[PDB]
Each structure stands twice: as structure tokens, then as C-alpha cells.
């Protein structure tokens, strides 16, 4: 052995990985394989391998070699493999490899070779493998290549070849592999592949071909063909005519527009066919002869019909994708025994018949989304047992059968609006993922690991509308007090025929507004009492019908009318501290405006559909009318306070003033809590829970409707006595 | 130098990723094939018991690799991807028993 | 061709070693020869970070096909004979070692 090597092996010396700048000395003369790659050898002197007469394999990759002496490779008559990649050879050494008649494999890739001398490759009578990729060749060396009839593999990828002339490879009768990808080829002559009768692999990817090559009708032994990532747009009718043994064709990443009808027929060895983006194709391709397909893909076309003999002719299919077409009638799929995946999304399918999916034992995945399907029979589901995924979404379904789908593991039925019935929870025991058209549909499955998409919370209860047994009691008490007290005040006020002062007048109308609020609370309590613990089948009908619209109108109309009426009362006292005629007209205008504000949300979309209570500001995750309404209410309260402050600074008169005061106050604080819950995303409000929010909204929103009359019946007495006096005197 | 002896041969194969869009590469591989002078035999084991277990003393020699090295190929795919293919390159071969 | 995978015969004295016995010679059978099919080993390629079985090797061996369980009582010079056993190859053919 010598200082810088291994020399350990069966006469196999390996010295790669060192900093040797020259061939080492002192090795055995019977070495049959030398590996001195990855070193700092830049030049080979004359007779540099005279101590290795029996060497057979030589590796010189990774060096900075840039000059080979013509007589450097002398006496290597047994050399068979020579590697010279990752070097800096500016040209192919023709006078240095002349005496290598036993050479079989030669690597010259990753160099800076840009010229091939015409005298090169003269003397290599046993060459089999040649590497010429990763170079700067601008043309095919036709003349040098007509000297190697025994060549079997050739690569010319990653170069700058623009076109292939006539009879370029007219002397290579043993070539089996040819690579021409990652070049700038944009034109092929007619007679350019003549003589390649044994060729099996052809690669033409990442080029600039503008038209489909007609020169491929000369390779009867061709099996694999690839021409993807080109600019081919039209495939001529009858293209693969002289290639009956094709098994793999790559044609994706091309702007295809038209494909001939009789173009892929009579290909018994093809196993796959994927075509995408063929916009100007309106007929199903002919496939009389191609009966060994395992995956068919035809999407983005204008195909409107499917031949009825698709499964009968061929029994090898596993996947089928026919999305993005104009298909509206589905032929019988009986016959495709081996079929497993079907994709038919984004079509015009309108019905599903009994025999559509009959005879599909191996079907596992089905996709029928965005097809506008509205009629599905009670069949075509029992024959497909082992099915896990069923995607039927964004359709016009009205009734979904639940027979034969007990083995599902993931169901998607989100997007339909006419399916208001409840799905049975006993028919989806094995189901694990669910999405439903309505939120309340999760109640049957999820309790009274599924993880349904709507994810019902406090605002979408399943059992109790109101909630706990306290809020329910709180809302029941508010309804029983406010209605009767308001009725007693109206009857006592609108009794005498004497002239009614405006101060005494506004009280009757505050009462009539409140009476309307008590009617809304009673409606809510009756609805809760009717459906106790069964807020599953009474939710969709309530929230998608006419009851919600009526209830929502009363809440908005009653709440907004009282605030506007209270504003006039404060101005009336301020003006008093003649004008009696204007006050009635003002009251009539306030009622008219309150009616418009209430009826405005009944016409637009998405509102009165956020909570089962149908209030306008149940957060409304509608940010119009709600935000608009809450801002208007805040501006009216600030003006009354200022006016009364003005009046603050500014017997019976003292009693009336004091009465109009308490209401500007009793009312202010509650509007306060509801409005604070409202501005939630700006301050985060220390992450208020949705249940405490619902409880606070229920307790406080109708709360003034019951405290306003009691501040006038018995508590804080001013003239109630007179009323009773006068009414009783009346009775 | 019988042509049918246990020796090593070279051939070229094309490597491409099955799923990711990657450019194909042409690589050189070493293969060992031939015949060995030693023959195979199987003799009945003479057991003295009530239970018999594989009573055949087999001795068969096969042409198998002796020394090899592991080299990885950097495959360049569409966009940004550096998928790596690995294989062992055969350095030498000899005849060794299949069982031992 | 005499080098093909055939069945040969031999003898062999029989005497119980663990305990004194008499000796007896029986005709056995074995296989020996070369098969026409050759052996080859080709490497495997895989794109995963973790390596796997580096090579794919095929090899044919001359191995028995059919056997008969037999027995042979002897004389161990004891209170009883203790018996033996084997398989009497009746036909032999080539088969994959790793089959």
C-alpha cells in the first residue's frame, strides 16, 4: 500500500476524497479498478497510467481537469468504464480516446463542451452507453454519431438544441433509450427518426414544440413516450398509428384545445389516460381497442353524454374523473366491477335512478357536489357496501334517503336549503364526520367524535331555549308584570273627556309602546313552554318561517317607539318651562317612524336569522341595521340628558318634572349594559362567554318595560291616586 | 475464463419519481450473474426422537454481492424539491451459500 | 447431460449412539447436480430517507420434492429398542432458495 490510499479490496484501489494533485505511485500493478475522484488533479501528463496495464475501470469525476495529453491514455486496452463528469473540458478529446476499442461506457456530462469535432468517436467499436447532457451543445453531431452502430443508450438533455435535421439518427440500429428533454427544440423534420426500429423510450419534455410531431410514425417498438410541458394545442386525428406497443404517454401542462375522435383508439397496451383543459371537445373519444385502461380522466371539456358501453368494453378500471363538463344523464354503471372512485362534480345532473349505481361492489368514494341534483330515488345505494366518503353538497336536495349508507365514515351535505327534515341518528352509527344543512340537525347525532360542522352553541340550544331555571323564571316574571301594569295605566289615562295636557298625554303612549314589548315577551315564553326539552324539530320551522319575522318586528317596533316618545316628553317640559296642537302631530310622526324602522329589517337577507329569540342585536355576527340601531339610540339619550341638564340647571310642575326625570334615568343604565356587551371585538371585554351574554340580553332588554309602569302605579306616587279617584269615581 | 462464471455486468436504467413532477435521470448500475462450480445437495437428517423437524441438510451456493457502497442520487423536481434516490453500487461479487 | 439435478443413493450404518446398539445399513437418498437457470442480484432504488433491502437476488437450488416418513427399530441392547426416523426422497427438482 502507499501513504494516501486504501488499496484494500480484490485488486480494487480507492483513493477518492484526498487532496492528491497527481496519480499516486507505489500501488500494485494488478489493480483492476482505480477510484481517484474528488481530487485536485488538473492535467494528465503523457504516459500517466503505465503502471496499471490491467486496469479496467477508471473514475476521474469531481476534479478540475482541463487538459488531457493525447498519449496520456496509452496501454489501457482493457478499459471498459470511463467517467469524466463534473470537470472543465471545453471539448471532447478525440485524439486521447482513439485507442480505447474495448471501451463500453463513457460519461462526459456536466462539462463545458460546446463543440464536437468531426473526427470524434472514431475507434470505439464497442461503445454502449454515452452521456452528453448538462453541456452547451447547440446542434446534434450527426456525422460523429454515424460511427457507433452498437450504441444502446444516449442522452442529450439540458442543452441548447433548437431543431433536429433529416436523417439525424439514420445509423443507430441498436439504440433503446434516447433523452432530449430540457432543450429548446421547436421543429422536427419528417424524416428524422428513420432507422430507430429498436427504440423503446423517447423523452421530449420541457421543450417548445408548437405542433404535434408527425415523425413518430417510424418506431414500431416504442413503449414509453413523454412530451409534457410543451406548447402543443391540437392532437391530429390518427396520431399514434405506427406505435402499437405504447404503454405510457405524458401530455399534461399543455394548452390543448382540440383532440381528434379517432386518436387514442386501438391501443391495447395503454393503462392510463388523463386529459385536462380540452375546451373545444364535445364528443366522447372512441376507444374501440383500448380495453386495458386503469384510470380515465376527462375534465374541462364540453362533453354532454357518456357512451352506454363504457364498462362493458373494458373491465380494468379503478378510478374515473369526469368533472367540469355538461353531463346531465348518467348511464348505468353496471359492469365496472373493479371501479373504486367516481368523480362527477360540477355538472348538470338532475336525477338519480334505481340502476345508476347498481353493481358496484368495490365503490368507496363518490362525489356529486355542485350538480344541481334535486331527485334521488330510494335505490342505487344498497349495492355499494364498502363506501366511506359520500360528498353531495351545494345541490337542490329535498329528501335524502338513509338506506344502504350505514358504512359511511365521512358525509358532506352542506349547502342544501330545501332539506328541512331530520335525519335519523340510528342509521349512522359508524359515521364519524358529518356536515348538515341546518345547525339543529346535530342535536339528533351529537348527543340529545362526530364533530358536526355547524357546532351549535348558546345561541343555538338543543334542549332549553331560555337556558337555566333562573333566566326562565326571570323572563316569566317580566312577562306577568309588564302586560297587566301597562293595561291598567292605559285604561286609567284614557278615561276622562276633559282636555288632556301634553305632559299627561305622553304617558299613555309610553304605555302603548310598552304594552307591545310585553306582548313580545309573552310570545317568547309561550314558545318556550310549548317546546320544553325538544328544541330540535321546532327550530328549523321557527327560524325559517313566518313566526320569527312577526316576533322580530314587535321587538324592534316596541323598543324604538318608546325612546322616540320619551324624547318628545323631555322637549315638551323644556318648552313649557298654543303648542298643544303640534304635540299630537309630533306623536303621530314618531309612531310612523317607529313602524318604518321596525319593518326595514323584514325585507333584507340574513337578519332575524341569528338566534331563536329573533332580536335585532343578538350580536348579529347583519352589522348594519344592528350597529345602526344601537348608535341612534345612544345619540337620543345624550341629547335628553343635555336638555334636562340644561333644565337641571334651569308643586304640580315640580312633580311632573320629577317624573320625567326618573324615566330618563331608570332607562339609561340598561341600554348601557346591552350596548357594552355589543362593542365586544374592539376591547375584547375580557372574553365574555356567549351564555352570560344571552342571559344578560334576556334579562335586561325587556326589563324597562315592567319598571316603567310601577314607577307610576304604586311606587313614587304623584297622581295615580287621582286616576283611581277619578276612574273609581267614573266606575 | 468461462463466460458462465459468477461475474459482474453493467447496465443503464432511467429513475423518475412516481408522484412529484421530477425530471428523469439515466444512471449506470452493476449486476452480478453467472454460475458456480460447486453443486447443491440435500441429505436426510437421521433423527432419533418422536418428532421430525426439517430433516434435510441442504447446501446450495449462489452468486451474491460481496462488497458494496451506498450512493444517493439527487433528483430535481418541478419547482423547489430535492427528492433523493439511494441505491447500493456493487463493487465485487463471489459465490456464497444461500443458507450460510 | 450428467450434470443435471438428479437423485443419488448411499449407505450408512445405523447404531444408537446415546445407548449401546447393534448396526444396520439402510438405503438413503439425496440430491446433487447443477440447474440450467442462473443466479442474479440486482439493486433496488427507493426515494425514502430510511434505506431498505439493497438487492433483489434469485437463485435456483436442487431440492427434494416428495418424502416418506419411515422408521427403523434397532437393538440397543436394552429393555427396549428406541427407534429412529427420516424422509425417503422419491423425487428431486430445482426450486428457488427464497421461495
From Swiss-Prot, chain A:
Its main location: membrane. GO terms for molecular function: G protein-coupled receptor activity; protein-hormone receptor activity; transmembrane signaling receptor activity. Disulfide bonds join 1-7, 5-15, 311-336, 442-452, 443-448, 548-614. Changing residue 335 to C: In DPSL; uncertain significance; when transfected in HEK293T cells it results in slightly reduced WNT signaling; decreased protein expression in transfected cells. LRR repeats lie at residues 30-51, 54-75, 78-99, 102-123, 126-149, 150-171, 174-195, 198-219, 221-242, 245-266, 292-313, 316-337, 338-359, 362-383, 386-407. Residues 1-29 form the LRRNT domain. Keywords: Biological rhythms, Cell membrane, Developmental protein, Differentiation, Disulfide bond, G-protein coupled receptor, Glycoprotein, Immunity, Innate immunity, Leucine-rich repeat, Membrane, Osteoporosis, Phosphoprotein, Receptor, Repeat, Signal, Spermatogenesis, Transducer, Transmembrane, Transmembrane helix, Wnt signaling pathway. It is found in: Cell membrane. Expressed in multiple steroidogenic tissues: placenta, ovary, testis and adrenal. Expressed also in spinal cord, thyroid, stomach, trachea, heart, pancreas, kidney, prostate and spleen. Glycans are attached at residues 40, 171, 266, 286. The keyword Repeat applies. It is a multi-pass membrane protein. One of its GO terms (cellular component) is plasma membrane. Residues 1-474, 527-550, 604-622, 689-694 are extracellular. It comes from the Eukaryota. The chain crosses the membrane at residues 475-495, 506-526, 551-571, 583-603, 623-643, 668-688, 695-715. GO terms for biological process: bone mineralization; bone remodeling; circadian regulation of gene expression; digestive tract development; epithelial cell proliferation involved in renal tubule morphogenesis; hair follicle development; innate immune response; intestinal stem cell homeostasis. Changing residue 68 to V: In DPSL; uncertain significance; when transfected in HEK293T cells it results in slightly reduced WNT signaling; decreased protein expression in transfected cells. Belongs to the G-protein coupled receptor 1 family. It is linked to Osteoporosis: A systemic skeletal disorder characterized by decreased bone mass and deterioration of bone microarchitecture without alteration in the composition of bone. The result is fragile bones and an increased risk of fractures, even after minimal trauma. Osteoporosis is a chronic condition of multifactorial etiology and is usually clinically silent until a fracture occurs. Delayed puberty, self-limited: A condition defined as the absence of testicular enlargement in boys or breast development in girls at an age that is 2-2.5 SD later than the population mean. DPSL is often familial and is highly heritable, most commonly seen with an autosomal dominant inheritance pattern. This is Leucine-rich repeat-containing G-protein coupled receptor 4. It comes from Homo sapiens.
Swiss-Prot record, chain B:
Expressed in the outer nuclear, inner nuclear and ganglion cell layers of the retina, and in fetal and adult brain. It is found in: Secreted. GO terms for cellular component: cell surface; collagen-containing extracellular matrix; extracellular space. Its main location: secreted. Keywords: Deafness, Disease variant, Disulfide bond, Secreted, Sensory transduction, Signal, Vision, Wnt signaling pathway. Changing residue 88 to W: In ND and EVR2. Disulfide bonds join 6-63, 22-77, 32-93, 36-95. Residues 6-99 form the CTCK domain. GO terms for molecular function: cytokine activity; frizzled binding; protein homodimerization activity. One of its GO terms (biological process) is decidualization. Changing residue 62 to A: Impairs oligomerization. It comes from the Eukaryota. It is linked to Norrie disease: Recessive disorder characterized by very early childhood blindness due to degenerative and proliferative changes of the neuroretina. Approximately 50% of patients show some form of progressive mental disorder, often with psychotic features, and about one-third of patients develop sensorineural deafness in the second decade. In addition, some patients have more complex phenotypes, including growth failure and seizure. Vitreoretinopathy, exudative 2: A disorder of the retinal vasculature characterized by an abrupt cessation of growth of peripheral capillaries, leading to an avascular peripheral retina. This may lead to compensatory retinal neovascularization, which is thought to be induced by hypoxia from the initial avascular insult. New vessels are prone to leakage and rupture causing exudates and bleeding, followed by scarring, retinal detachment and blindness. Clinical features can be highly variable, even within the same family. Activates the canonical Wnt signaling pathway through FZD4 and LRP5 coreceptor. Plays a central role in retinal vascularization by acting as a ligand for FZD4 that signals via stabilizing beta-catenin (CTNNB1) and activating LEF/TCF-mediated transcriptional programs. Acts in concert with TSPAN12 to activate FZD4 independently of the Wnt-dependent activation of FZD4, suggesting the existence of a Wnt-independent signaling that also promote accumulation the beta-catenin (CTNNB1). May be involved in a pathway that regulates neural cell differentiation and proliferation. Homodimer; disulfide-linked. Component of a complex, at least composed of TSPAN12, FZD4, LRP5/6 and norrin (NDP). Binds FZD4 with high affinity. Interacts with LRP6 (via Beta-propellers 1 and 2). This is Norrin.
Amino acid at each position: 500500500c502507499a501513504a494516501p490510499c486504501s488499496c484494500d479490496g480484490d485488486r480494487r484501489v480507492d483513493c477518492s476524497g484526498k487532496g492528491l494533485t497527481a496519480v499516486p505511485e507505489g500501488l500494485s500493478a494488478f489493480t483492476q479498478a482505480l477510484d481517484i475522484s474528488m481530487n485536485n488533479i488538473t492535467q494528465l501528463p503523457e504516459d500517466a497510467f503505465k503502471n496499471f496495464p490491467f486496469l479496467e475501470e477508471l473514475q476521474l469525476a469531481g476534479n478540475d481537469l482541463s487538459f488531457i495529453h493525447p498519449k496520456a491514455l496509452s496501454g489501457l486496452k482493457e478499459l471498459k468504464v470511463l467517467t469524466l463528469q463534473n470537470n472543465q473540458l471545453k471539448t471532447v478529446p478525440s485524439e486521447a480516446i482513439r485507442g480505447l476499442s474495448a471501451l463500453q461506457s463513457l460519461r462526459l456530462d456536466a462539462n463545458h463542451i460546446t463543440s464536437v469535432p468531426e473526427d470524434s468517436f472514431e475507434g470505439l467499436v464497442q461503445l454502449r452507453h454515452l452521456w452528453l447532457d448538462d453541456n452547451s451543445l447547440t446542434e446534434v453531431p450527426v456525422h460523429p454519431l454515424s460511427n457507433l452502430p452498437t450504441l444502446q443508450a444516449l442522452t442529450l438533455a439540458l442543452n441548447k438544441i433548437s431543431s433536429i435535421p433529416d436523417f439525424a439518427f439514420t445509423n443507430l440500429s441498436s439504440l433503446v433509450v434516447l433523452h432530449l428533454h430540457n432543450n429548446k427544440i421547436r421543429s422536427l423534420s419528417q424524416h428524422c427518426f428513420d432507422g430507430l426500429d429498436n427504440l423503446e423510450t423517447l423523452d421530449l419534455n420541457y421543450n417548445n414544440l408548437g405542433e404535434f410531431p408527425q415523425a413518430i410514425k417510424a418506431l414500431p417498438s416504442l413503449k414509453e413516450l413523454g412530451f409534457h410541458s410543451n406548447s402543443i394545442s391540437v392532437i391530429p386525428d390518427g396520431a399514434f398509428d405506427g406505435n402499437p406497443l405504447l404503454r405510457t404517454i405524458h401530455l399534461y401542462d399543455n394548452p390543448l384545445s382540440f383532440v381528434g375522435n379517432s386518436a387514442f383508439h386501438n391501443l391495447s397496451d395503454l393503462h392510463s389516460l388523463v386529459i385536462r383543459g380540452a375546451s373545444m371537445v364535445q364528443q366522447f373519444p372512441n376507444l374501440t381497442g383500448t380495453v386495458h385502461l386503469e384510470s380515465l380522466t376527462l375534465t374541462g371539456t364540453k362533453i354532454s353524454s357518456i357512451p352506454n358501453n363504457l364498462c362493458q368494453e373494458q373491465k380494468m378500471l379503478r378510478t374515473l374523473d369526469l368533472s367540469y363538463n355538461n353531463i346531465r344523464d348518467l348511464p348505468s354503471f353496471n359492469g365496472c366491477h373493479a371501479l373504486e372512485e367516481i368523480s362527477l362534480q360540477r355538472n348538470q345532473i338532475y336525477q338519480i335512478k334505481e340502476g345508476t349505481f347498481q353493481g358496484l361492489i368495490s365503490l368507496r368514494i363518490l362525489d356529486l357536489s355542485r350538480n344541481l341534483i334535486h331527485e334521488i330515488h330510494s335505490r342505487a345505494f344498497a349495492t355499494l357496501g364498502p363506501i366511506t366518503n359520500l360528498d353531495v353538497s351545494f345541490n337542490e336536495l329535498t329528501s335524502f334517503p338513509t338506506e344502504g349508507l350505514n358504512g359511511l365514515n365521512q358525509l358532506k351535505l352542506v349547502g342544501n336549503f330545501k332539506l328541512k327534515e331530520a335525519l335519523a341518528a340510528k342509521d349512522f352509527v359508524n359515521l364519524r364526520s358529518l356536515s348538515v344543512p341546518y345547525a339543529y340537525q346535530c342535536c339528533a347525532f351529537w348527543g340529545c367524535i362526530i364533530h358536526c360542522t355547524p357546532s351549535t352553541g348558546a345561541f343555538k340550544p338543543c334542549e332549553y331555549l331560555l337556558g337555566s331555571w333562573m333566566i326562565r323564571l326571570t323572563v316569566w316574571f317580566i312577562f306577568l308584570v309588564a302586560l297587566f301594569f301597562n293595561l291598567l295605566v292605559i285604561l286609567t289615562t284614557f278615561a276622562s273627556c276633559t282636555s288632556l295636557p301634553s305632559s299627561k298625554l305622553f304617558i299613555g303612549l309610553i304605555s302603548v309602546s310598552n304594552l307591545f314589548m310585553g306582548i313580545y315577551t309573552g310570545i317568547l315564553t309561550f314558545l318556550d313552554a310549548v317546546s320544553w326539552g325538544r328544541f330540535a324539530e321546532f327550530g328549523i320551522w321557527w327560524e325559517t318561517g313566518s313566526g320569527c319575522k312577526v316576533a322580530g318586528f314587535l321587538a324592534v317596533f316596541s323598543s324604538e317607539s318608546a325612546i322616540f316618545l320619551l324624547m318628545l316628553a323631555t322637549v315638551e317640559r323644556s318648552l313649557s318651562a298654543n303648542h298643544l296642537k303640534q304635540f299630537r302631530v309630533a306623536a303621530l310622526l314618531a309612531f310612523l317612524g317607529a313602524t318604518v324602522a321596525g319593518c326595514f329589517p323584514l325585507f333584507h337577507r340574513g337578519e332575524y336569522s341569528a338566534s331563536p329569540l329573533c332580536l335585532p342585536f343578538p350580536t348579529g355576527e347583519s352589522l348594519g341595521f344592528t350597529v345602526t340601531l344601537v348608535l341612534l339610540n345612544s345619540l337620543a339619550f345624550l341629547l335628553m340628558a343635555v336638555i334636562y341638564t340644561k333644565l337641571y340647571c334651569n308643586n304640580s310642575q315640580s312633580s311632573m318634572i320629577k317624573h320625567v326625570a326618573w324615566l330618563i334615568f331608570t332607562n339609561c343604565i340598561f341600554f348601557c349594559p346591552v350596548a357594552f356587551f355589543s362593542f365586544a371585538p374592539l376591547i375584547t371585554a375580557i372574553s365574555i362567554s356567549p351564555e352570560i351574554m344571552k342571559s344578560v340580553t334576556l334579562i335586561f332588554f325587556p326589563l324597562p318595560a315592567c319598571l316603567n309602569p310601577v314607577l307610576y302605579v304604586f311606587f313614587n306616587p304623584k297622581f295615580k291616586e287621582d286616576w283611581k279617584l277619578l276612574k273609581r269615581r267614573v266606575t | 475464463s468461462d463466460p458462465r462464471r459468477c461475474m459482474r455486468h453493467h447496465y443503464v436504467d432511467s429513475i423518475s419519481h412516481p408522484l412529484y413532477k421530477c425530471s428523469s435521470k439515466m444512471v449506470l448500475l452493476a449486476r452480478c450473474e453467472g454460475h458456480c462450480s460447486q453443486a447443491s445437495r440435500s441429505e436426510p437428517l437421521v433423527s432419533f426422537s418422536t418428532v421430525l423437524k426439517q430433516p434435510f441438510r441442504s447446501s446450495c451456493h449462489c452468486c451474491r454481492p460481496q462488497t458494496s457502497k451506498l450512493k444517493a442520487l439527487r433528483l430535481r423536481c418541478s419547482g423547489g424539491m430535492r427528492l433523493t434516490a439511494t441505491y447500493r453500487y456493487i463493487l465485487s461479487c463471489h459465490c456464497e451459500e444461500c443458507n450460510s
